[PDB]
Structures are given as structure tokens and as C-alpha cells.
Amino acid sequence: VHLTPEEKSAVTALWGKVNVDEVGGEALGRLLVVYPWTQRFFESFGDLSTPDAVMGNPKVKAHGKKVLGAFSDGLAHLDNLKGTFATLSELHCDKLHVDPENFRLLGNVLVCVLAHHFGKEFTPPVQAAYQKVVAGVANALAHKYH
Amino acid sequence: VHLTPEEKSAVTALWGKVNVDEVGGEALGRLLVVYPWTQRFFESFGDLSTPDAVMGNPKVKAHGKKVLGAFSDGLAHLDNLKGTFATLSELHCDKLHVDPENFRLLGNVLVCVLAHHFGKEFTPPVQAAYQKVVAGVANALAHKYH
Amino acid sequence: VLSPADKTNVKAAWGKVGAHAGEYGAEALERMFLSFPTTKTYFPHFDLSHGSAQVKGHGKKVADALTNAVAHVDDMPNALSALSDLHAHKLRVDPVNFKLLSHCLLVTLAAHLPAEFTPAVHASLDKFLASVSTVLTSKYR
Amino acid sequence: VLSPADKTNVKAAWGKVGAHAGEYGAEALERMFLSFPTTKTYFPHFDLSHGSAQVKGHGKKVADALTNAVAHVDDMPNALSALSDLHAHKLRVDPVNFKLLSHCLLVTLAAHLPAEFTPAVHASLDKFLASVSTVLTSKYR
Numbered sequence: 001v002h003l004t005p006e007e008k009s010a011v012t013a014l015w016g017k018v019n020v021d022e023v024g025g026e027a028l029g030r031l032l033v034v035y036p037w038t039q040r041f042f043e044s045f046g047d048l049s050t051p052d053a054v055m056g057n058p059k060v061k062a063h064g065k066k067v068l069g070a071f072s073d074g075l076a077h078l079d080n081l082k083g084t085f086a087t088l089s090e091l092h093c094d095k096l097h098v099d100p101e102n103f104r105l106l107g108n109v110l111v112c113v114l115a116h117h118f119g120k121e122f123t124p125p126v127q128a129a130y131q132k133v134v135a136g137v138a139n140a141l142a143h144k145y146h
Numbered sequence: 147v148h149l150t151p152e153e154k155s156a157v158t159a160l161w162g163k164v165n166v167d168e169v170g171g172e173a174l175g176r177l178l179v180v181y182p183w184t185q186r187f188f189e190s191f192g193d194l195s196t197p198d199a200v201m202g203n204p205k206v207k208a209h210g211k212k213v214l215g216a217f218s219d220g221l222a223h224l225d226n227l228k229g230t231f232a233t234l235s236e237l238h239c240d241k242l243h244v245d246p247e248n249f250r251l252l253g254n255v256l257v258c259v260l261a262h263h264f265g266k267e268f269t270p271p272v273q274a275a276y277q278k279v280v281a282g283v284a285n286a287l288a289h290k291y292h
Numbered sequence: 293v294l295s296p297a298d299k300t301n302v303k304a305a306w307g308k309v310g311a312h313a314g315e316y317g318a319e320a321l322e323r324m325f326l327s328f329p330t331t332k333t334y335f336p337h338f339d340l341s342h343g344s345a346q347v348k349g350h351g352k353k354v355a356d357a358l359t360n361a362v363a364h365v366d367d368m369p370n371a372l373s374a375l376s377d378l379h380a381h382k383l384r385v386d387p388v389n390f391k392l393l394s395h396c397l398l399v400t401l402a403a404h405l406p407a408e409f410t411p412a413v414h415a416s417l418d419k420f421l422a423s424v425s426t427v428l429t430s431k432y433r
Numbered sequence: 434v435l436s437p438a439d440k441t442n443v444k445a446a447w448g449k450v451g452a453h454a455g456e457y458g459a460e461a462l463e464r465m466f467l468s469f470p471t472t473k474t475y476f477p478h479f480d481l482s483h484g485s486a487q488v489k490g491h492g493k494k495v496a497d498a499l500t501n502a503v504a505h506v507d508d509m510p511n512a513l514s515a516l517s518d519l520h521a522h523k524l525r526v527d528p529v530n531f532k533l534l535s536h537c538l539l540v541t542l543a544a545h546l547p548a549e550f551t552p553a554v555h556a557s558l559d560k561f562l563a564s565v566s567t568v569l570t571s572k573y574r
């Protein structure tokens with residue numbers, strides 16, 4: 001991913017305000033609600049029967065933390081997403097066989113969650129920079145398919 | 147793309163029966179009929195207003211021949227598709243901005259045309275081998291997006 | 293969204309299928325499992341071998357459901373409500389898989405009915421299968 | 434296919450746009466053109482700069498079309514038939530672009546309507562926009 005120094009600064013600044021404990025769970029939870037077939041990958045996670053059960057599910061919140069940490073690892077090394085995500089790509093592609101369109105969906109749900117949290121601060125240029133990041137992360141996750 | 151020796155033999159035997167003057171045009175023509183937004187990329191080709199107009203269009207047939215030639219070339223370089231198709235990838239991605247889902251559609255329309263022409267010869271194992279090939283070609287064309 | 297002409301093409305084509313509906317359904321499933329092995333994960337307990345009586349039995353069910361859908365092409369959500377609950381709510385099938393089966397159905401039809409599989413009919417059938425797929429992947433109760 | 438609950442959610446949520454129709458529609462277009470620059474190819478002679486009156490004007494049209502879709506949500510192909518002919522027949526817009534605009538509309542609504550944009554309403558709005566997109570990319574005359 002090629003971000004201008006201005007774009008990188010904008011993304012980094014915003015991310016520093018993102019709640020490490022909650023935003024990942026909000027994004028993962030919304031993925032499960034908005035695109036229900038994704039629940040098939042999370043059988044062991046317990047109760048996903050209703051939007052409220054999903055968003056309050058402890059395992060969804062916990063797992064979401066990890067997911068966010070991986071996005072955070074991406075932001076720390078934008079020039080080597082493929083390397084950073086190699087193990088996760090093997091997991092999601094070779095082992096789990098997640099269709100790669102779903103990687104794009106989660107990235108876009110995260111973007112919606114950022115917009116929801118930050119309101120007018122999530123300007124079109126800030127969004128454009130984040131879209132480059134989540135496209136890069138999705139591509140890196142899908143690398144074993146390519 | 148790795149084919150078993152059985153798969154390679156089967157792919158080669160079927161391809162030898164392909165009419166190289168017609169099949170590319172049939173595949174391209176059916177792409178323009180079945181997925182009509184793809185016509186936007188071929189505005190200069192003239193009359194594309196009806197299925198009969200598309201299928202009988204000389205420029206569709208001629209162009210189709212080139213496309214088929216690219217598939218034919220790929221069959222001889224299955225272990226180096228990303229290299230072989232690099233120039234075409236730059237053309238379709240960087241210059242024309244074709245969304246890569248359309249590469250998958252054309253590959254699958256080609257498979258339908260082979261099924262149409264060869265019926266009982268196009269067995270499910272033969273189809274499976276060809277799906278590997280057209281997936282490989284589509285992936286190589288999309289490489290500039292990855 | 294299907295045109296009036298699309299609906300006519302679909303009914304005419306599926307009519308020509310007739311008594312072979314079940315055989316074609318079984319062949320489409322076999323083509324899917326072989327060409328796209330990840331689809332087998334939805335049938336973990338199935339005998340998926342070539343000539344499987346279980347796949348044959350399932351192919352007939354799939355074909356009969358399509359025949360029902362063709363019969364109710366103007367009212368598919370109501371006609372397929374039970375099937376939608378099964379695929380969207382219970383089995384949670386990823387929508388990509390419906391694209392794969394739809395393709396394998398078209399391939400099957402092309403191989404068996406080449407005269408019938410004109411560009412216009414190809415187009416109408418693709419739209420119809422996409423429409424069925426959307427209904428089966430929607431939760432609308 | 435939209436559930437009864439989906440239609441309820443969409444009517445309630447979109448109903449809050451009101452006089453901000455032009456504003457939100459324009460913001461959604463601006464987000465799309467900036468985030469996904471290939472979409473600009475469909476507007477070769479537009480002023481697409483930030484704060485463009487032409488984009489503001491177009492945003493109002495899109496928003497008003499969405500208001501139309503909501504008021505005819507059970508019968509959208511007939512209500513949007515003119516817009517389908519424009520986008521599918523005349524402009525031949527690639528279906529991927531509707532996913533891009535739909536995403537940017539959702540981002541815009543999330544940024545402006547925090548209380549309304551719950552997970553359930555988010556899910557309903559996504560389905561709604563996908564349904565509108567299908568109509569606008571279909572040829573069904």
C-alpha cells in the first residue's frame with residue numbers, strides 16, 4: 001500500500017483514538033449481523049441468534065480484539081503487508097477456506113464503524129486513505145489465493 | 147496452475163478440437179450478451195444492439211480470435227501465467243480499468259462454449275481441469291490489482 | 293430482475309429439460325464438487341463419489357425445486373420461503389457458492405441441450421439462476 | 434429479498450434524511466469519487482471538485498431517487514424502470530460500482546446518524562441498497 005506522508009499521518013492520528021478493546025468486536029459483530037452467512041465460521045462462539053446476542057457475545061468481543069490487532073500490525077508496516085499477513089493468509093485461505101470477498105466485506109464494515117464513531121472527523125479524504133489500507137489488508141489476507 | 151498428467155492430456159486433447167477462428171468470438175459475443183455492461187468497453191465495435199447483431203459482428207469475431215490466442219498461449223505456460231500475462235494485465239487493469247470479476251465471467255463463458263461444442267466429451271473431470279486453467283488466467287490478468 | 297421475454301425463455305428451456313431434470317441436477321452437483329472442491333464442505337457426511345445414489349437423489353431434489361421456481365417465476369420469494377430459510381438461516385451458505393452451482397447448471401445444460409442453449413437463452417437462464425440464488429440467500433421472514 | 438422488519442428499519446432510518454437529502458447524497462458521491470477514482474469515468478464532463486455545485490445537484494437527485502425507492506419498496510422495478518433504463522441500458526454501469534456507492538452511502542449515514550445506525554438497521558440498509566442496485570443494473574423491459 002502506497003500512502004502519501006499526509007495520508008499516513010491522517011490514518012495514524014485517527015487510529016490512535018480507536019478503542020483497542022471495543023472497535024474490533026463492533027466490526028466483527030456487525031460483519032456477523034449484516035452478512036449472516038459469515039456466522040458459519042464461528043460455530044464454537046456460542047449465541048449468535050440475534051443482533052443483541054451477537055454484539056454482546058464475549059467471544060466475539062475477544063476475537064474482535066485480535067482482528068483489530070492484525071489491522072494495527074498492518075498499519076505499522078504498510079510496505080510489507082504480504083509478509084505481515086502470511087501466516088493469517090495460510091489460516092484463512094488454506095485451512096478455513098474463507099471466500100476472499102468476505103475479507104473486503106470486513107474491511108468495509110470496519111470503515112463504517114470508524115465513521116460511526118468519529119462522525120464529521122471521518123472526512124472523505126480520511127476515508128479514502130483508510131480504503132487503501134483495508135484493500136491492502138484484504139489483498140494480503142487473500143495472497144494464498146493469488 | 148498445476149495439472150496432473152491425466153488433466154494435461156485431457157485439456158490438450160479437447161483444445162486440439164477447438165475451432166480457433168470461431169470459439170473466441172463465440173465466447174466474447176456471449177459475454178457481451180449475457181453481461182451487457184461489458185459492452186461499454188467495446189463502443190467502437192459497432193452494432194451490439196441484439197444477440198444476433200453481437201454474434202454476427204465482424205469486430206467481435208476478430209477480437210475474439212485474439213483473446214482465444216491468449217488462452218492458447220497460457221496453456222503452454224501454465225507455470226508462469228503471471229509473467230506471460232503481465233503486458234495484458236497492465237492493459238486491462240491500469241489502462242482500461244476492467245473490474246476483475248469480469249475476467250472470471252469471460253473464463254466461465256468460455257467454459258460454457260466448450261461444453262456447448264463438445265457435449266459428452268466435456269466431462270466433469272475435463273471441466274475441473276479447465277476451471278483451474280481459466281482461474282489461473284483470470285488471476286494473472288488481475289495481477290496488477292493484487 | 294427478469295424481463296417478460298426472459299421469463300418466456302426460461303419456461304421454454306426448462307420445459308425442454310423435462311424428464312431429465314433430475315439427471316441434470318445430479319450432474320450439476322457432481323461438476324460443482326469436482327471443479328470447486330470447497331463446496332464439498334457443505335456436505336460433510338455425503339457419499340460424493342461418482343455415481344453416488346445420494347448425489348443422484350439430491351440432484352433430483354434440486355431440479356424439482358427449480359421446476360417449482362420456474363412455475364412461480366413471478367412470485368419466487370413466496371414459493372421458495374422454506375428453501376430460503378434452509379439455505380440462508382440454517383445452513384448459512386456463502387453466496388459465492390450459488391454462483392458456482394449456477395455455472396455448473398449452465399454447463400450441464402450447454403452440454404446436453406446445445407441447440408437450445410442460444411445466447412439469448414443463456415442470458416435468460418443466467419439471470420433466472422441469479423434470481424433464485426438471491427432468494428435462497430436472503431432471510432426475509 | 435427484504436423482510437418486513439427490513440422495510441420498517443429502512444423507512445424509519447431514511448425518513449430522518451429529510452431536507453438533508455441533497456447534502457448526504459452529495460457527500461456519498463464525493464466519498465465514492467475520492468475513494469474509488471475509477472468511478473469518475475462515468476462522469477467525464479462533470480465538475481467533480483470538492484464543494485462542486487454540480488455534485489451537490491446530482492446528490493439531490495440520487496437521494497430523491499432513494500426516497501422514491503423507499504415509497505415503492507414492495508414494487509421497485511416498476512417504480513425505478515426509468516432509472517434502470519438509464520443506468521443499465523444507456524450508461525452500462527458495471528455492477529461493481531453500485532457496491533462502491535452503496536458502501537459510501539452507508540458510511541455517510543453512519544457519520545451523520547449515529548443513533549439510527551444500529552447493527553440491525555445497518556443490515557437492513559445494506560440489503561435495501563443491494564436491492565436497488567440489482568434493479569438499476571437489470572434490463573427488464
Ligand code: HEM
Pocket residue numbers: 038041042044066067070071088092096098102103104106107137138141
Ligand atoms: C479481512 C480481515 C481479517 C483479519 C485482519 C482477520 C484476522 C484474524 C486473526 C488475527 C485471527 C486469529 C488468528 C490466530 O489466533 O491464530 C483470525 C481467526 C479467524 N478468522 Fe479472521 N480475519 C479477517 C477476516 C475474516 C473473515 C471475513 C472471516 C469469516 C467470514 C474470518 C474467519 C476467521 C475464523 C473462523 C478464525 C478462527 C476463529 C477460531 O479460533 O475459532 N476471518 N482472524
Ligand code: HEM
Pocket residue numbers: 184185187188190212213216217234237238242244248249250252253283284287
Ligand atoms: C479474461 C480473459 C481475457 C483475456 C485472455 C483477454 C485478452 C485480450 C487481448 C489478447 C487483447 C488484445 C491486446 C492488444 O491488442 O494489445 C485484449 C484487449 C482488450 N480487452 Fe481483453 N481479455 C480478457 C478479458 C477482458 C474483459 C472481461 C474485458 C471487459 C470488457 C476486456 C476488455 C478489453 C478491451 C476493451 C480490449 C481492447 C479492445 C480494442 O482494441 O478496442 N478484456 N484482451
Ligand code: HEM
Pocket residue numbers: 331334335353354355357358375378379383385389390391393424425428
Ligand atoms: C439453485 C440453487 C439451489 C437449489 C434450487 C437448492 C435446492 C435444495 C433442495 C431442494 C434441498 C433439499 C431440501 C429438503 O428436501 O429438505 C437442498 C438442500 C441442501 N442444499 Fe441446496 N440448493 C441450491 C443451492 C445450494 C448451494 C450452492 C449449496 C452449497 C454449496 C447448497 C447446500 C445444500 C445443503 C448442504 C443441503 C442439505 C443437504 C443435507 O444435508 O441433506 N445448496 N437444496
Ligand code: HEM
Pocket residue numbers: 472475476494495496498499516519520524526530531534565566569
Ligand atoms: C443507489 C444507486 C443509484 C441511484 C439511486 C442513482 C440515481 C440516479 C439518478 C436519479 C440520476 C439522474 C437521472 C435523470 O437525470 O433523470 C442518475 C444519473 C446518473 N448516474 Fe446514477 N444512481 C445510482 C448509482 C450510480 C452509479 C453507481 C453510477 C456510476 C458509478 C451512476 C452513474 C450515473 C451517471 C453517469 C448518470 C448521468 C449523469 C449525467 O451525465 O447527467 N449511478 N443516477
